[PDB]
Design a protein around this motif. Structure first.
Motif, short mmCIF file in Angstrom:
data_model
loop_
_atom_site.label_atom_id
_atom_site.label_comp_id
_atom_site.label_asym_id
_atom_site.label_seq_id
_atom_site.Cartn_x
_atom_site.Cartn_y
_atom_site.Cartn_z
N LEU A 177 38.52 6.33 -38.80
CA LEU A 177 39.02 7.32 -39.74
C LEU A 177 39.02 6.81 -41.16
CD1 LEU A 177 39.24 9.30 -37.78
CD2 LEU A 177 41.72 8.97 -37.72
N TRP A 178 39.28 5.52 -41.33
CA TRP A 178 39.24 4.97 -42.67
C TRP A 178 37.77 4.94 -43.09
CZ3 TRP A 178 36.35 1.23 -44.79
CH2 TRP A 178 36.65 0.89 -46.12
N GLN A 179 36.87 4.77 -42.13
CA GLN A 179 35.45 4.70 -42.44
C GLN A 179 34.94 5.97 -43.10
OE1 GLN A 179 33.45 1.78 -41.88
NE2 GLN A 179 32.39 3.04 -43.42
N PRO A 208 45.12 -5.03 -50.38
CA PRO A 208 44.40 -4.10 -51.25
C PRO A 208 43.24 -3.36 -50.57
CG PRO A 208 43.59 -6.26 -51.65
CD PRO A 208 44.77 -6.43 -50.71
N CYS A 209 43.23 -2.05 -50.69
CA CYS A 209 42.16 -1.26 -50.11
C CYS A 209 40.88 -1.77 -50.77
CB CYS A 209 42.37 0.21 -50.43
SG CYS A 209 41.18 1.29 -49.65
N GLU A 210 39.88 -2.11 -49.98
CA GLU A 210 38.64 -2.63 -50.54
C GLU A 210 37.76 -1.55 -51.16
OE1 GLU A 210 36.50 -4.35 -47.08
OE2 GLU A 210 34.96 -2.87 -47.57
N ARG A 211 38.00 -0.30 -50.79
CA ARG A 211 37.20 0.80 -51.31
C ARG A 211 37.76 1.37 -52.62
NH1 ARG A 211 37.58 4.93 -47.38
NH2 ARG A 211 35.43 4.78 -46.59
N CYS A 212 39.05 1.72 -52.62
CA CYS A 212 39.66 2.29 -53.80
C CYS A 212 40.71 1.34 -54.38
CB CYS A 212 40.32 3.64 -53.46
SG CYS A 212 41.92 3.52 -52.67
N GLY A 213 41.36 0.59 -53.50
CA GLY A 213 42.36 -0.36 -53.94
C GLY A 213 43.81 0.08 -53.85
N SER A 214 44.10 1.15 -53.11
CA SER A 214 45.49 1.58 -52.99
C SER A 214 46.29 0.71 -52.03
CB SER A 214 45.56 3.05 -52.56
OG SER A 214 45.46 3.91 -53.68
N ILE A 215 47.60 0.94 -51.99
CA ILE A 215 48.47 0.17 -51.11
C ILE A 215 48.46 0.74 -49.70
N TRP A 228 46.43 2.80 -42.75
CA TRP A 228 45.56 3.65 -43.57
C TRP A 228 45.78 3.47 -45.07
CZ3 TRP A 228 50.43 4.87 -43.22
CH2 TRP A 228 51.02 5.79 -44.12
N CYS A 229 44.92 4.10 -45.87
CA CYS A 229 45.02 4.04 -47.33
C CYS A 229 45.52 5.37 -47.89
CB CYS A 229 43.65 3.71 -47.92
SG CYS A 229 43.62 3.41 -49.70
N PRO A 230 46.58 5.35 -48.70
CA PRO A 230 47.12 6.59 -49.28
C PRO A 230 46.18 7.29 -50.24
CG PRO A 230 48.79 4.90 -49.22
CD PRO A 230 47.46 4.21 -49.01
N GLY A 231 45.38 6.52 -50.97
CA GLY A 231 44.46 7.11 -51.93
C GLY A 231 43.03 7.19 -51.43
N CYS A 232 42.85 6.93 -50.15
CA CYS A 232 41.52 6.93 -49.59
C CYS A 232 41.34 7.93 -48.45
CB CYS A 232 41.22 5.52 -49.10
SG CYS A 232 39.56 5.01 -49.32
N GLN A 233 42.44 8.33 -47.83
CA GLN A 233 42.39 9.26 -46.70
C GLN A 233 43.15 10.57 -46.91
OE1 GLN A 233 42.73 5.82 -43.72
NE2 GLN A 233 41.45 5.48 -45.52
ZN ZN Z 1 41.58 3.30 -50.15
#
Ligand code: ZN
Length: 252
Positions: free
Chosen positions: A175-177, A226-233, A246-251
């Motif tokens: 799902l993160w993918q 750190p999210c490697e794609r966007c960098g969110s927490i 999961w990532c809050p700013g990525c999903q």
């Molecule tokens: Zn992210």
DNA sequence: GCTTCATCCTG
DNA sequence: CAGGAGAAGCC
């Protein structure tokens, strides 16, 4: 552990004793003692997988079934050798040189032909992500089919009835993918996200299988990282009565 | 879901 | 040392 880790072990098993005449058999479960003498002098014709379910077939048409659930693990040692641990040995399949050992596992049953389509778990499972003939297209159809169309991924991506071999870490990762959380449904998706989801569902698990131990964790056991794609927490919560990364700013 | 059987490791 | 990290059982 899941399909990826189950196929890698299966193979290690085949690499060690397949085709080899068994010089001894042993089981912890009394009920299985009866198959020991029966198996001595026979050999594993092939070890098969169908998710986290392990089927070790014998030359006499018998098949050893086993699910590692969350604690069972297979060892492969040289015959007569038994490295130590507190783990409870459940199965011994030994030949002249190589031997395999199963520890912890509790779901260990012996099947004859018929139960291979009758066993409680075997009957239920859907296609195997590790299964070649299984294509994104097919998997794509299944997602939209009426049997899963109205189901959230958080739960579906764990349900063996849908696809065998997927577990939690693969759940978060897939799902993160494709930048999704576990609250969506095949029906609530555009053609670009379904096709994406589709591939990730097969490619990732395989990538894990082929490279895990290259494959690395991108959101599993990464809270505070750190999210490697966007960098969110990345936060740790509970989804499907289990931990969900999961990532809050990525999903979304 | 929720509740439970069922091993083993941090924590 | 209680919790906690793949499925089947019952509402
Ligand atoms: Zn992210």
């Amino acid at each position: 552990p899941q399909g990826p880790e189950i196929r890698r072990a299966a193979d290690n098993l085949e690499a060690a004793i397949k085709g080899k005449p068994l010089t001894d058999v042993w089981f912890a479960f009394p009920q299985l003692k009866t198959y020991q003498s029966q198996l001595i002098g026979q050999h594993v014709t092939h070890v098969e997988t169908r998710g986290k379910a392990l089927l070790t077939h014998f030359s006499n048409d018998l098949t050893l079934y086993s699910h590692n659930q969350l604690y069972g693990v297979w060892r492969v040692v040289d015959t007569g050798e038994e490295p130590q641990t507190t783990r409870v040995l459940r199965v011994k399949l030994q030949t002249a040189d190589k031997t395999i050992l199963l520890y912890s596992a509790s779901d260990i049953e012996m099947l004859r032909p018929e139960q291979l389509t009758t066993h409680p778990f075997l009957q239920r499972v859907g296609p195997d992500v590790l299964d070649p003939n299984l294509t994104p297209e097919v998997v794509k159809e299944r997602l939209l089919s009426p049997r899963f169309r109205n189901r959230q991924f958080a739960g579906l991506l764990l349900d063996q009835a849908f696809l065998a071999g997927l577990g939690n870490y693969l759940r978060v990762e897939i799902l993160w993918q494709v930048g999704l959380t576990g609250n969506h449904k095949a029906k609530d998706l555009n053609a670009a996200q379904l096709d994406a989801l589709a591939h990730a569902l097969l490619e990732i698990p395989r990538f894990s299988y082929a490279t895990r131990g290259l494959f690395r964790f991108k959101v599993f056991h990464r809270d505070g990282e750190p999210c490697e794609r966007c960098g969110s927490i990345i936060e740790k919560t509970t989804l499907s009565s289990r931990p969900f990364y999961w990532c809050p700013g990525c999903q979304h």
